[PDB]
């Protein structure tokens, strides 16, 4: 396929937040948290939750998970450890409802 | 009215093909199973019209 | 033993062919069902 577009790049990146292990890999870092850039980028990616940008969101979870992380970066290892257990409890029910 | 008038037809044809597939078995069966395939696809089309 | 050779075997070869001809359709009947799920597509 030809060269990508920033719309599809940001779309696939925000849609990648639906995966739990990928968010776990993003939070278990040490370089992207030294400068206020990744936080401002995640807070910037909040335009997908509003129309007409919401008409292309395939996975409803990535948006709300984004609002959670943007809700948590305002106010280190331990909480990052805290979230995945709970989300793990939530996942399989939805998976059952999907197919 | 709509596609519901044709679905019946298609359904009625499916059995009519099955009988044929039963009555052949010889190496003629191949040709027949082709037609059967087409019928099934038609069914799928109408259901697509029932999605939205 | 030879007391022609080709004719006495082709019959049973054909009788062996027909059975396989009976068995070759079932696998296609199994593949069609797998081909129908791709065409099949509730709403939340």
């Amino acid at each position: 396929n030809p060269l990508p577009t920033r719309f599809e790049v940001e779309l696939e990146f925000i849609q990648s937040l639906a995966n739990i292990q990928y968010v776990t890999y993003l939070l278990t870092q040490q370089q992207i948290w030294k400068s206020p850039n990744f936080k401002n980028y995640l807070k910037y990616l909040e335009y997908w939750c509003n129309p007409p940008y919401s008409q292309c969101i395939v996975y409803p979870n990535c948006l709300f998970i984004l609002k959670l992380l943007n809700g948590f970066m305002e106010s280190x290892x331990x909480x990052x450890x805290x979230x995945x257990x709970x989300x793990x409890x939530x996942x399989x029910x939805x998976x059952x409802x999907x197919x | 009215q709509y596609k519901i008038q044709e679905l019946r037809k298609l359904l009625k044809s499916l059995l009519l093909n099955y009988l044929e597939l039963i009555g052949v078995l010889p190496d003629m069966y191949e040709r027949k199973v082709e037609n059967i395939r087409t019928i099934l696809v038609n069914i799928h089309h109408l259901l697509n019209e029932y999605r939205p | 033993w030879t007391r022609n050779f080709h004719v006495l075997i082709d019959l049973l070869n054909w009788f062996r062919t027909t059975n396989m001809n009976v068995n070759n359709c079932i696998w296609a009947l199994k593949s069609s069902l797998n081909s129908m799920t791709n065409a099949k597509l509730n709403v939340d």
């Binding site: 990648s16 995966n19 129309p51 | - | -």
Partner: peptide, 19 residues
């Protein structure tokens, strides 16, 4: 509006989580 949900909610039934 409901018109966006009748055409947008149909694509939410086919979707496995991203890998």
């Amino acid at each position: 509006n409901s018109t966006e949900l009748l055409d947008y909610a149909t694509k939410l039934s086919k979707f496995i989580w991203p890998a």
